[PDB]
């Protein structure tokens, strides 16, 4: 079973979520997956530090109510485990400071400038196969993947050289008022989005403004050219209900766009409302959620412990008595 | 209540002359008015390659040489940087807390070399920081190569708290001897020409045979006399006979009249050589016992991790991490 690692940053859309999550949660027996809560990348930009902490517990409540299993996968918290930090110095030392410089001053911390090595002693401590990144990931895998590779040349086989995951992924979800953008967590306008935990009031006030088009009379037709947004609701709809396009044309004859908009909102929330549920279920109970978060670190740090062994074997340390 | 006094030890090189009677020797003395930590820092030692079985042994040496030259476990916390992780965790925390700015001000950094340097070159300013705080260190007794890096920690503690609390430390900062070739320049544990240096594990006979080559002077005829300016070599040789025997420079010139130049280098010789031998004694026997290492590291690791720990929670409360159950 490949060893799947994915850093979770503790701050989700139905894009997330439909476009891939949601598929990820059906393979955790297929794959060794790990899902670890990046609060240490976290800190390169301030916030309130009760709101970082509660963030942080927010995000394994999401998790587990998307479906991840703590006993199938690992998931847990980064700062809990000491080895992604050790590791992390450990490969500064095997990192160019050209290579962290080209990937983007005197007024940022170097926290900003350093993550990128932190970045790779995630993945590597695992023995980590795959990691699936979104695309402004790219350059920090490829990163990850030379200081792998060059670590190797010097010592012999210590690390995987880790490989990304091409998603196949189950939907692609364009922003709401800008068809031809797909959706972004990052979108700094929120009516782009639906974020997993909104409920069917804000859901439907951000469908019904969704960019539609002038045809008339209105036709409930895919065509990404001329109707990218009737085309991403009838998406919208799809990856929820699973109805191919073909089916939606059909059953949307005769109807007008609000209608459209009512019942993508509709199926939405719907989709939501279940995760929603168990969302507070785990986000309630705190008790819970600090018996993943212990189980998970301690299953974390026993293979994280076995990598930074070799490593710290390898580069000449006196092994801690 | 003691002061806290926080020292890295680089596990490679020779510890000089220098070193030994213009420093540790005297906080050897001071392990009962201080609480004195001893960090040998092999995070630091891998921002330059070197074969790794060379890097585990040189730790291996540093420790015993620091046990032979009197630091006692069982009043001082002496450990391996490696064995705790706390240095690793607060030194990435510390990252945030630290401008980009003020590491590429760093004099040795401050471009095609720049880009070929490795990040922990860049970086250990930061990891030197939090080797320091995590101890709520108060003195660390550091040479002139380490004051910026002595200041960048200051700094960073002061904006820390700043922002969070008082939760750091502020740190505060704390014999002649010349190289032996060219008495106006000090001597280096990281000097190319070995003829300069007297290290501290080197046997008599080599400390005898560098000494005797010595720089002197010409003067005519030759007088043993303390004159920094003009003579520089007999002065130098004076002044490490003064710190080894602890005799003033008065005390030699007069021991020293109608004496001449081989005389100073035999006395020297004899009194430097005497100080190495009983330190070397020390040296084979703890470092031929490596139960004892063993037990040591053990032991002052783990009274290490109990204070960084500490530290550690506090500065992980402070930030906003969900605490380790
Ligand atoms: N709007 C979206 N529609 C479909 N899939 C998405 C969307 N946003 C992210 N993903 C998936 O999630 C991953 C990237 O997520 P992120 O890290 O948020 O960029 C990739 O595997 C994508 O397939
Ligand atoms: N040749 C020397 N004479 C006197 N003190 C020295 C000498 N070399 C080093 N030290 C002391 O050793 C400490 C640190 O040495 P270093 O960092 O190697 O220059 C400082 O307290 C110095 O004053
Ligand atoms: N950089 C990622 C988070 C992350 C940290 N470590 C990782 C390792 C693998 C994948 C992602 C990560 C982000 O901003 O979202
Ligand atoms: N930078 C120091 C070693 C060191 C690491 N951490 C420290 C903390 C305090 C004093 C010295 C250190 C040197 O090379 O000599």
Redesign the interface.
């Known amino acids: 079973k490949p060893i799947v690692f994915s850093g979770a940053q503790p701050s989700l859309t139905i894009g997330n979520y439909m476009g891939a999550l949601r598929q990820w949660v059906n393979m955790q027996d297929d794959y060794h997956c790990i899902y670890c809560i990046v609060?240490?990348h976290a800190?390169?930009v301030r916030?309130?530090?009760?709101?970082?902490?509660k963030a942080?517990?927010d995000t394994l409540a999401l998790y587990l109510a998307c479906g991840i299993d703590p006993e199938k996968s690992t998931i847990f918290?980064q700062?809990?485990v000491?080895?992604h930090?050790?590791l992390?110095?450990?490969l500064?030392?095997?990192?160019?400071?050209?290579?962290?410089?080209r990937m983007t001053?005197?007024?940022?911390?170097?926290?900003?400038?350093?993550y990128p090595?932190?970045m790779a002693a995630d993945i590597l401590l695992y023995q980590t196969n795959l990691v699936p990144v979104g695309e402004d990931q790219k350059q920090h895998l490829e990163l990850s993947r030379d200081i792998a590779q060059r670590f190797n040349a010097l010592?012999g086989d210590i690390f995987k050289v880790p490989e990304p995951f091409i998603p196949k992924s189950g939907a692609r979800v364009m922003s709401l008022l800008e068809p031809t953008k797909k959706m972004s967590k990052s979108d700094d306008n929120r009516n782009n989005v639906i974020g997993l935990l909104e409920d069917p009031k804000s859901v439907v006030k951000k469908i019904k403004r969704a960019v539609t088009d002038s045809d008339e009379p209105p036709v409930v037709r895919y065509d990404v050219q001329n109707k990218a947004g009737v085309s991403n609701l009838l998406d919208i709809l799809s990856a929820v209900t699973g109805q191919s396009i073909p089916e939606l044309e059909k059953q949307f004859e005769g109807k007008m766009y609000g209608h459209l908009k009512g019942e993508v909102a509709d199926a939405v929330s719907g989709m939501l409302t279940e995760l929603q549920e168990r969302y507070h279920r785990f986000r309630n109970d705190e008790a819970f959620l600090?018996?993943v978060?212990?189980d998970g670190?301690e299953k974390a740090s026993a293979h994280a412990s076995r990598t930074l062994k070799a490593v710290?074997?390898?580069?000449?340390?006196?092994a801690?008595?």
């Open positions: 609060d240490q800190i390169t916030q309130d530090a009760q709101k970082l902490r942080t517990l918290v700062s809990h000491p080895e930090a050790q992390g110095w450990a500064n030392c095997y990192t160019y400071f050209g290579e962290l410089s001053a005197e007024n940022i911390n170097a926290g900003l400038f350093d090595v932190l010592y600090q018996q978060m212990k670190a710290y074997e390898a580069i000449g340390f006196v801690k008595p």
